[PDB]
Design an enzyme around this catalytic site. Structure first.
Site, mmCIF file in Angstrom:
data_model
loop_
_atom_site.group_PDB
_atom_site.id
_atom_site.type_symbol
_atom_site.label_atom_id
_atom_site.label_comp_id
_atom_site.label_asym_id
_atom_site.label_seq_id
_atom_site.Cartn_x
_atom_site.Cartn_y
_atom_site.Cartn_z
ATOM 1 N N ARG D 54 32.649 33.917 -15.838
ATOM 2 C CA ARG D 54 32.242 34.828 -14.419
ATOM 3 C C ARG D 54 30.650 34.917 -14.821
ATOM 4 O O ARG D 54 29.788 34.500 -13.831
ATOM 5 C CB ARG D 54 32.632 36.114 -14.156
ATOM 6 C CG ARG D 54 33.871 36.039 -13.593
ATOM 7 C CD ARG D 54 35.164 37.107 -13.891
ATOM 8 N NE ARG D 54 35.308 36.768 -15.361
ATOM 9 C CZ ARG D 54 36.412 36.068 -15.205
ATOM 10 N NH1 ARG D 54 37.206 35.719 -14.368
ATOM 11 N NH2 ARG D 54 36.839 35.467 -16.698
ATOM 12 N N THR D 55 30.182 35.560 -15.949
ATOM 13 C CA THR D 55 28.715 36.054 -15.997
ATOM 14 C C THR D 55 27.822 34.695 -15.817
ATOM 15 O O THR D 55 26.745 34.733 -15.416
ATOM 16 C CB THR D 55 28.681 36.942 -17.391
ATOM 17 O OG1 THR D 55 29.511 37.895 -17.218
ATOM 18 C CG2 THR D 55 27.164 37.540 -17.202
ATOM 19 N N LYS D 84 21.029 24.458 -38.217
ATOM 20 C CA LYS D 84 20.000 24.266 -39.307
ATOM 21 C C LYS D 84 19.640 25.677 -39.814
ATOM 22 O O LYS D 84 18.349 25.743 -40.504
ATOM 23 C CB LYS D 84 18.791 23.685 -38.559
ATOM 24 C CG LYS D 84 19.303 22.320 -37.920
ATOM 25 C CD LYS D 84 17.810 21.606 -37.283
ATOM 26 C CE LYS D 84 18.156 20.294 -36.801
ATOM 27 N NZ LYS D 84 16.862 19.645 -36.206
ATOM 28 N N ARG D 105 23.817 36.423 -23.555
ATOM 29 C CA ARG D 105 25.092 37.108 -24.037
ATOM 30 C C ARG D 105 25.050 36.759 -25.337
ATOM 31 O O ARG D 105 24.934 35.780 -26.193
ATOM 32 C CB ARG D 105 26.167 36.519 -23.145
ATOM 33 C CG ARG D 105 27.576 36.869 -23.894
ATOM 34 C CD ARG D 105 28.700 36.635 -22.902
ATOM 35 N NE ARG D 105 28.582 37.686 -21.885
ATOM 36 C CZ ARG D 105 29.854 37.839 -20.841
ATOM 37 N NH1 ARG D 105 30.927 37.239 -21.240
ATOM 38 N NH2 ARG D 105 29.534 38.748 -19.817
ATOM 39 N N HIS D 134 26.503 46.068 -20.991
ATOM 40 C CA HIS D 134 26.783 44.875 -19.890
ATOM 41 C C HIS D 134 26.283 45.378 -18.600
ATOM 42 O O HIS D 134 26.745 45.435 -17.623
ATOM 43 C CB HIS D 134 28.261 44.701 -19.874
ATOM 44 C CG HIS D 134 28.542 43.368 -19.254
ATOM 45 N ND1 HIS D 134 27.689 42.533 -18.544
ATOM 46 C CD2 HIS D 134 29.797 42.562 -19.413
ATOM 47 C CE1 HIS D 134 28.403 41.340 -18.390
ATOM 48 N NE2 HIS D 134 29.540 41.291 -18.703
#
Ligand SMILES: Nc1ncnc2c1ncn2[C@@H]1O[C@H](COP(=O)(O)OP(=O)(O)OP(=O)(O)O)[C@@H](O)[C@H]1O
Ligand SMILES: Nc1ncnc2c1ncn2[C@@H]1O[C@H](COP(=O)(O)OP(=O)(O)OP(=O)(O)O)[C@@H](O)[C@H]1O
Ligand SMILES: Nc1ncnc2c1ncn2[C@@H]1O[C@H](COP(=O)(O)OP(=O)(O)OP(=O)(O)O)[C@@H](O)[C@H]1O
Ligand SMILES: Nc1ncnc2c1ncn2[C@@H]1O[C@H](COP(=O)(O)OP(=O)(O)OP(=O)(O)O)[C@@H](O)[C@H]1O
Ligand SMILES: O=C(O)C[C@H](NC(=O)CP(=O)(O)O)C(=O)O
Ligand SMILES: O=C(O)C[C@H](NC(=O)CP(=O)(O)O)C(=O)O
Ligand SMILES: O=C(O)C[C@H](NC(=O)CP(=O)(O)O)C(=O)O
Ligand SMILES: [Mg+2]
Ligand SMILES: [Mg+2]
Ligand SMILES: [Zn+2]
Ligand SMILES: [Zn+2]
Lengths: 150, 310, 152, 310, 310
Positions: D54-55, D84, D105, D134
């Site tokens: 969703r986000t 790396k 996120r 959030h």
């Protein structure tokens, strides 16, 4: 003026002629401050014999010849005074011990001593003008300069 | 009691020239005159915490040739140490209430020494502890060097390969250094050189030794060419450039070798000894392996039987 | 008068940290790296105290605590006394003031806090409370007792 | 400039009631009449270091509906941080030389706050940082509550499930607490209770909240029933007893619900909301999700445009 | 047509001084005043077969800043080459029927050259092929050197770290060697030295270069200090002794630096540049990265547009 004064100890130990910068190291290793007994420390004190010195006084506490000997690795030219009734009753100098137990950690990562309920232990010997430590378990030998403590 | 009765056998550095010679003399006798019941009613633990073919099987075979029974394991994965998180100390503490001796191999240096601190009156025999010691390899090696050279003194001995992690060459060098006038050539990559504590010990005894970059330099002079495997399971990742044998012995490398010279190798070999060497009269690594029976029979006899055998 | 070899000189100029609670004095010496100097130092551990029974005591010549060290001291030993000395006299005396932020020296007890993995200095909003003192992490926003945090 | 121009959007704690109302008013307008070129010539990074449906997709769709371009990744495994050894710090340091805003996120609490210390003048929008905050979920949540209830005041709001690790309810509770006279009902397992710093905030603002062991206990009086998923990727191994939904909402549990009540859930659900709920008039989690478009468009528009005229 | 119209950009070896100056001049202009619709109606493939942060995101951002669309992948694992056995040849054969240019990074040397044999009239831009070439890194590097130093001639340039596997320094050395009177200092472990074919090229052009075992050795005279990462994903197992940075730059090492000196690094760094360097006026690796935008925009514009007027 002021009430500044350091009262002489009746009974205990005075570790004198510690080289500069070593006094705090000795306190750290041998956990000398883990006690309820009165302790007095002077660091960077002027000295006739050394110029600069550290000094550790511990009430009601004594060091055996072996405990005094442990000091040889770090402060070989130190004087250990036993004190009773305010009097220096014994003066000892550290002689190189044959073993150092408990306080050091074997630098070999694959030594059994790290994984198991045993105490560290090294044989002590003179090598050139270095001190070599040989782990009792893994039998590898190291310069005391690279053998860390706990 | 004989000098070795009920003794722990952990490090060659704890033994004297006389201890070594006593093992060898007992080996001759038992090989000459087997005493198949010398260790009857003994039960011995065979505890291998890392891989082995020769050391474990020869040891167990030796125990049976002398009448002893055998319990143990060839890996730790199904012990309570392997699955339930038990310490080695506790493992030794219980096993030592069962058996008359503990033979142990372990991947950490010092394991066998630690075991002695929890085994009470039960003797621990070090079948190898990490890259530290391998004293029973040294016994069979000494036996083999004596068998083929007639002596353990005034020998020219080359050791080739991974000397840093070779528990075999640490033990063997310390042992030969207990004898008079032996000379050492160390042929190793820089990164896997013989450790300083071994070299210092040689210098204190005034033994001569030198570093060489090739087998050919020393071939003419050597009585014993002791080849080793690179101990890849002990290598730090930084040392991975050294996994391949840097020195490879082939049959053609043996032209200018003394007729008395033997090629030894504690085994297993990867490629450091080419198979064409096998048929040459210099090859003696299989014979060397077979002598493990006599050395290990001898050691068990000395440790578990109060009196000297005949 | 024989004993005049046993009496430490007073300091002309420097600091005396007093009323340090027992077992804290030695800790302060390491954390503040105080002994890493050529200046004269005297230390009393487990000394008698009218005010607090037992105490530790640290004296350092020609040397003063940094603002960092003063702020941290307020956390390690809140009842400790900082004495500034010039010309053999106590010219300044105070309990260290609690700061609002403490950076660098503390470690967030939240194991999934980003501050552990990354090249940033730790930072905690410091607010005085009843029984303890609260430290709120700048990153994860979680708040803890200085007891839980100072068990770094 | 509008209050949110060029501001980082990290934690509901850093926003006021007025800030939240601004986003809500701006979202209502963009929903009413769209502004397809509002972010023309903007390029925005979408950097997801943990899973999302969703986000990330609503955020990216939002950017496109406003005319912006999008770069980024949905997995860190093929960035130089993944292969790396690069730090998050350096990652943000370079990405912030490319783009006009960063949506991120991340599985660690604090990651978005940290990014703001390396992004210079580039605004960071926190799409979720571990179990902490959030904020954009809360924006869409508020918008959905406002739409269905007509108000953000004097509500009865129940939050059910994993309240400990629910970054969604940490932000939502904080935001609703900036409004007047809301009452909270917390329905959670003990091991996963609403954390104390949230409860403390409720106390020092004199907001009524209580704990309940069932949904039926409060069904008849709630305006908003906010269901959550057990955050199993966050649970300590010691908390695996709580992996299954403790509270399962079914259509039949809604018999005594207020008619205007809505069931919300930031999604994804596992079993805590049975599929028979979906057909009921109370089910509003998909409409809620759909509102992510208008809340996120609104947030982007306010952060990247000095003034809006709509 | 401009010299670079429709040309493949594979290796610095195939470009002239004039080509490089064209990109640099074009980048300076796009940085000065942007051309947001220059690549309108172009769709460009971004195909990364190994990890990247800077190269892929700057390339894609660049395409968007010029108005182009982007398709592709950052991992081959979900292409038909990753799951169905498809060759790289066929992959390029079909993708080149879709797009107007192909940006590719690949773990094998030669991959970009090979792509040009299958892409027909579609230009291929090499974003890195194994340890061989990295031409767009060199473009941005030159641009950054030019910006900070005022010239690409008579510079003193040190390159530190893994020069053997550094495709970045292979391309950068080649390019700087097309200018006059530059002097090179190579500071590298023996096992990872600048390869001989690079040194040979320097020799046959009469360019001065020397080897050094420390940075302080040349700190006082360098205009550009180019640091690199050990390419551990390229190292042979035999080279694992070199995994850690041999040379670690710290703020205190810069005490005798020329005031105009800049520290560059194509990034990512591990430990070869300590974070205390970042605050110093010599740190320029993030500004360098930021310049990837203008160099890559410039390259795309010259390759896809017949003539530019700016
Ligand atoms: N009762 C006491 N309390 C505290 N410290 C004492 C006491 N008696 C002696 N000392 C300290 O212990 C040390 C004792 O050494 P001593 O009394 O012989 O002086 P010294 O002749 O200078 O010693 P040295 O000859 O070893 O330098 C001195 O450092 C002294 O300060
Ligand atoms: N309890 C104490 N705490 C801190 N400092 C002290 C203490 N007792 C004495 N000192 C200091 O230690 C310093 C050295 O005194 P000490 O008696 O050891 O000197 P010394 O014996 O004449 O010289 P040497 O060290 O060569 O024997 C003096 O300046 C004194 O002020
Ligand atoms: N010149 C000096 N050199 C060394 N130590 C000093 C000096 N002046 C004071 N001190 C020490 O520092 C502290 C100063 O405190 P102060 O002189 O105010 O005594 P106090 O009235 O007991 O203080 P408080 O009320 O804080 O306990 C005392 O412990 C004293 O021993
Ligand atoms: N320089 C010093 N080194 C070691 N011990 C000291 C020193 N100065 C004082 N002491 C010891 O500390 C004790 C208390 O010192 P001081 O007189 O400074 O504090 P106080 O005012 O009596 O106590 P408080 O202020 O804690 O109520 C004294 O009994 C003395 O033995
Ligand atoms: O492993 C070697 O290379 C030499 C030596 N080999 C042996 O003991 C023979 P095995 O491992 O088959 O018991 C050892 O140290 O384990
Ligand atoms: O994951 C949850 O249960 C709640 C919440 N869910 C979302 O944001 C929806 P998504 O993970 O698909 O973007 C979250 O914190 O990630
Ligand atoms: O990886 C390096 O160390 C240098 C160089 N680095 C880059 O191109 C930056 P990135 O891998 O983030 O695109 C490379 O050759 O890939
Ligand atoms: Mg004296
Ligand atoms: Mg007082
Ligand atoms: Zn050891
Ligand atoms: Zn934190």
């Amino acid at each position: 003026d002021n009430k500044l004064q350091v009262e002489a100890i009746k009974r205990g130990t005075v570790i004198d002629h510690i080289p500069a910068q070593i006094g705090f190291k000795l306190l750290s290793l041998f956990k000398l401050t883990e006690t309820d007994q009165r302790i007095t420390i002077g660091l960077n004190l002027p000295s006739g014999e050394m110029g600069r010195k550290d000094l550790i006084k511990i009430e009601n506490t004594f060091l055996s010849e072996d405990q005094v000997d442990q000091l040889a690795l770090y402060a070989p030219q130190a004087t250990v005074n036993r004190i009773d009734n305010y009097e220096v009753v014994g003066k000892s100098r550290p002689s190189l011990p044959e073993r150092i137990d408990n306080v050091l950690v074997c630098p070999n990562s694959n030594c059994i001593s790290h994984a198991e309920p045993v105490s560290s232990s090294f044989a002590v010997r003179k090598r050139a003008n270095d001190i070599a430590l040989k782990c009792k378990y893994c039998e590898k030998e190291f310069s005391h300069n690279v053998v860390l403590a706990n | 009691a004989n000098p070795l009765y009920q003794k722990h056998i952990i490090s060659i550095n704890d033994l004297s020239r006389d201890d070594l010679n006593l093992v060898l003399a007992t080996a001759a006798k038992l090989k000459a005159n087997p005493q198949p019941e010398l260790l009857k009613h003994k039960v011995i633990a065979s505890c291998f915490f890392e891989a082995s073919t020769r050391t474990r099987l020869s040891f167990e075979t030796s125990m049976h040739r002398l009448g002893a029974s055998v319990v143990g394991f060839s890996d730790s994965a199904n012990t309570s140490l392997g699955k339930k998180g038990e310490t080695l100390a506790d493992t030794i503490s219980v096993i030592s209430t069962y058996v008359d001796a503990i033979v142990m191999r372990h991947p950490q240096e010092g394991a066998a020494r630690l075991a002695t601190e929890f085994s009470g009156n039960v003797p621990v025999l070090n079948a190898g502890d990490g890259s530290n010691q391998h004293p029973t390899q040294t016994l069979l090696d000494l036996f083999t060097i004596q068998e083929t050279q007639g002596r353990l003194d005034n020998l020219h001995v080359a050791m080739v390969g991974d000397l840093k992690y070779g528990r075999t060459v640490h033990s063997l060098t310390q042992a030969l250094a207990k004898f008079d006038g032996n000379r050492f050539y160390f042929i190793a990559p820089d990164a896997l050189a013989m450790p300083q504590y071994i070299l210092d010990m040689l210098d204190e005894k005034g033994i001569a030794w030198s570093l060489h970059s090739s087998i050919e330099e020393v071939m003419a002079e050597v009585d014993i060419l002791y080849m080793t495997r690179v101990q890849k399971e002990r290598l730090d990742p930084s040392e991975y450039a050294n996994v391949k044998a840097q020195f490879v012995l082939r049959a053609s490398d043996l032209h200018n070798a003394k007729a008395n010279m033997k090629v030894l190798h504690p085994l297993p070999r990867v490629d450091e000894i080419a198979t064409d060497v096998d048929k040459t009269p210099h090859a003696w690594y299989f014979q060397q392996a077979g002598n493990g029976i006599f050395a290990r029979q001898a050691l068990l006899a000395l440790v578990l039987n109060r009196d000297l055998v005949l």
